[PDB]
């Protein structure tokens, strides 16, 4: 037969590739190497829109003139002083190890293993909650409802990510959706497989209907995983 769109995505062509050359740099923490226990200080110069971040970034000038990017917290001003390190105070925009952040605090941009740089709760409008502290692990509620354990030396930032409420206003036009999907080149517009031919999809045929259950095993090979993949249930409730 012929290939699927998700099979063609794996080969890595311009039709499926991200235009990262349009984006501001990557957002990472300073390494622990330079922050053994130094507790640097910085000042915010400017706040900027990023086309590949779903959140605004802020530029910060540090001890030695170095300029870094950060995910901007809600409420941050130009001309603020932000601190990174163990003896930093508890204030919106400051980065601390999870072992110095009390229970009940809102946190974002958390590391999985220390030194990583930031992996979880980065998206516009998100926040996480510290639930419990211990000597072996700290426990955090994530925006999916999942409770996860981190090493207490993993770093995190205090506050909430800026840019929330994007989805309260509707997209009204195919043209606006065109521009939105062209910013980050997502595959748009989207076809339906039940309206393709048989060579093209497990669905497909002159009579436009799925002729067998949409639920598909976890152990099915590529070319077949379409529909509801390993679904525990279906329907509304």
């Amino acid at each position: 037969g012929k290939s699927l769109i998700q099979q063609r995505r794996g080969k890595g062509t311009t039709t499926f590739r991200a235009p990262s050359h349009r984006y501001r740099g990557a957002v990472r923490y300073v390494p622990l190497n330079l922050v053994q226990e130094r507790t640097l200080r910085g000042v915010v110069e400017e706040i900027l829109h990023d086309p590949g971040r779903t959140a605004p970034v802020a530029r910060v000038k540090f001890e030695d003139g170095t300029k870094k990017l950060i995910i901007a917290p809600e409420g941050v001003l130009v001309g603020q002083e932000i601190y990174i390190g163990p003896e930093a105070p508890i204030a919106i925009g400051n980065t601390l190890p999870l072992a110095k952040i009390p229970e009940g605090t809102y946190v974002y941009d958390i590391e999985g293993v220390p030194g990583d740089g930031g992996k979880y709760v980065r998206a516009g409008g998100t926040y996480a909650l510290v639930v419990s502290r211990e000597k072996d692990k700290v426990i955090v509620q994530l925006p999916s409802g999942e409770l996860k354990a981190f090493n207490p030396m993993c770093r995190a930032t205090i506050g909430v990510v800026a840019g929330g409420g994007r989805l309260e206003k509707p997209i009204v036009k195919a043209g606006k959706a065109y521009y939105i999907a062209k910013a980050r080149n997502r595959f748009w517009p989207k076809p339906r497989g039940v309206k393709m031919n048989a060579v093209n999809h497990p669905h497909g045929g002159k009579e436009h209907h799925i002729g067998r259950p949409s639920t598909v095993s976890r152990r099915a090979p590529p070319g077949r995983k379409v529909g509801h993949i390993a679904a525990r249930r279906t329907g509304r409730r």
Binding site: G75, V76, L77, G104, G125, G163, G164, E168
Partner: protein
């Protein structure tokens, strides 16, 4: 203000449906008005981009919500972090 029921959504006529027109008009009417600055305390704050707000008199520039400078989670975080 010539219209009774419609507002900023009169730009695209009888298209796209009632619920959607209402929602757009409401959001835009809440957004486009002026807001109080957290620095000088005057109603001079407008939106510059998605999530970036600026006062016209003092020049204060801060990060906030997409369509309103504040969010509920932001309010609660401010309160909790001020106390503890």
């Amino acid at each position: 203000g010539r219209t009774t029921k419609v507002g900023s959504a009169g730009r695209f006529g009888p298209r796209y449906g009632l619920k959607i027109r209402r929602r757009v008009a409401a959001v835009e009417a809440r957004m486009k008005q002026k807001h109080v600055c957290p620095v000088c305390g005057r109603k001079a704050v407008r939106r510059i981009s998605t999530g970036i707000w600026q006062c016209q008199k003092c020049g204060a520039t801060f990060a906030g919500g997409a369509y309103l400078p504040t969010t509920p989670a932001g309010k609660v975080a401010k309160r909790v972090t001020a106390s503890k």
